[PDB]
Design a protein around this ligand. Sequence first.
Ligand code: 5W8
Ligand code: GSP
Lengths: 463, 165
Amino acid sequence: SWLLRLFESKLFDISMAISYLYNSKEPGVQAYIGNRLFCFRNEDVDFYLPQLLNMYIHMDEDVGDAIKPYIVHRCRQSINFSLQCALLLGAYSSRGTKLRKLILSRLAPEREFIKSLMAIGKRLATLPTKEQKTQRLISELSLLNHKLPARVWLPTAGFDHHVVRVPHTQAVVLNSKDKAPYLIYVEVLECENFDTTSVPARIPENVALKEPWQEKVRRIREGSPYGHLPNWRLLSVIVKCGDDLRQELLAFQVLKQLQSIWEQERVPLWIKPYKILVISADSGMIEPVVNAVSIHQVKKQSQLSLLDYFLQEHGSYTTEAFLSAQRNFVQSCAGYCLVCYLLQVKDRHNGNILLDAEGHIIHIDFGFILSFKLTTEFVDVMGGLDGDMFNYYKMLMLQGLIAARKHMDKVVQIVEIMQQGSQLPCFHGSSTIRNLKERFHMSMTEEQLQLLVEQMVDGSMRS
Amino acid sequence: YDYLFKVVLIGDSGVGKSNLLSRFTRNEFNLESKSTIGVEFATRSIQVDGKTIKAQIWDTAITSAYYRGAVGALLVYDIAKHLTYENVERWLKELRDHADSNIVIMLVGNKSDLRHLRAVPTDEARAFAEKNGLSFIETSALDSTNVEAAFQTILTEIYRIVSQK
Ligand SMILES: CC[C@H](CO)NS(=O)(=O)c1cc(-c2c(C)nc3c(NCCNC(C)=O)cc(Cl)nn23)ccc1OC
Ligand SMILES: Nc1nc2c(ncn2[C@@H]2O[C@H](COP(=O)(O)OP(=O)(O)OP(O)(O)=S)[C@@H](O)[C@H]2O)c(=O)[nH]1
């Protein structure tokens, strides 16, 4: 009854459930939890879908039969859920297959919609320059409006909706690589429920420049057939036709949890997880952060040092706009340094860090993790090594570390389960989780942590 | 004091024979499960029509063969695992052969609490249930549902054997 005692308390959450599910070999417990999933809010359980489906694939049949019923139930009341399952089921197996076909079994429109989009990306491969790729993209995207009214949606959107229009003239390709990813803007009409509504009616078709996000919506709205409607909103996704996003997804969950941990405790670090979508385990989509551009390009257009740009874009240090931006900088630095450390990110450079209009930084590329540098340019923005704001940066890191230790298992859980039958490059070591746990230094005293943080920063400065 | 009833619990492994007994005999339950190795009894006395009886329940390495002189049998299956229901036919064939040819039998669907994971409908079971000379309650050992009722059905069922001159 001691187990059952716990499970019937308020203490029981989806986190706990999966942990016992992953470890417990008692089928009586497994089945009990399988059933208890239904009582939880749809929203809480969703976050763990990548874990659940991985278990289904790679674990004993016993575990699967306990899991399957809940999945099917969700699938029947949400095609979005159905979609994401099918995509995930496939990517993580190269047991799974039997269930995927049953789920794909109506939903036909969406799978072609996605396939077309990648097929586009693969096509840009024969065109060797960035600019050339972009021209073909816009043209070929224009062909999508012909089926544009559609009855399809972006799973990456916070909500249910129909895609109505692609402002093809506004789309752009992001690099010159052979299988370069490309960013597109998409118009949608919000729904209350996708599964229960009409597809909207077509509204017939009748410039592109560098601009902030809210100004870009205005311009597009005024130009859009559907723009007058209150139902109308603009979304955006980046398309990766030949790159795996499974490592990327793993990082996202970790970022989201750390974000919540620091939220529950009262540590004012700042970070920005960006939604990830996995299509094939070769291909994916990303929901982009708006109002941000790489440090490197920021340095090529300005010809300035980072601090000077801050001063240019916000004001003299006697202004609110600057001091606020500075605060936002420092808080975002500590957050991402800890994330880089905890996940042991590597290959950190100004191509992988974005700057938003309020001053936060945002690391964006999470290849090369598991199995961050402080350049003097960064330290300058903080007011220098002796600065109070720089000291505060160190203070936040400690605070955020003390908070993180208090919730270590929530984090490791997310990661430890994904190693399960995994052929990802980040899991090469037997160690890998074991080393990860050591990096929380759970044994250490706070005095020890104060010292370790100082040392970390000094190391981070050598370059 | 007045009568001694030999009852067996039989069924596939995992169906909940041992937890029914722990609920029914000691009002204790556990999710953690030590397999029953061979045989258990536990005992509890009840009163029917103002008469003191005593039920001796035996839980159950195939050869238990403990049936003999076994007047009643609770045959249990897990409602959430269809296969456990499938072997009920094979559990009634081996019944007759190594066990009394006129024993009182009640069929039991256990783990009724797993509403959303339910894999065996009450009607299909109860259909087979009334099609043949078996009893048919559904229980949950975990949330102490129908557990007393199940026993007291078979015991009352059992009692009505008086067959006097
Ligand atoms: C795009 C994927 C390609 C490979 O397939 N690699 S990538 O381009 O380097 C890259 C960019 C981003 C990203 C995000 C979440 N948000 C913006 C973003 N936001 C700005 C967009 N909007 C405005 C108004 O500036 C801009 C850019 Cl360049 N990237 N980005 C995320 C991951 C990522 O993969 C490492
Ligand atoms: N939700 C729910 N789970 C149950 C119930 N009864 C048993 N379980 C689970 O079934 C399993 C039964 O294990 P056990 O204690 O050995 O009983 P058994 O059915 O007799 O197993 P055996 O025949 O191999 S001895 C346990 O994990 C137990 O938690 C029930 O009534 N409701």
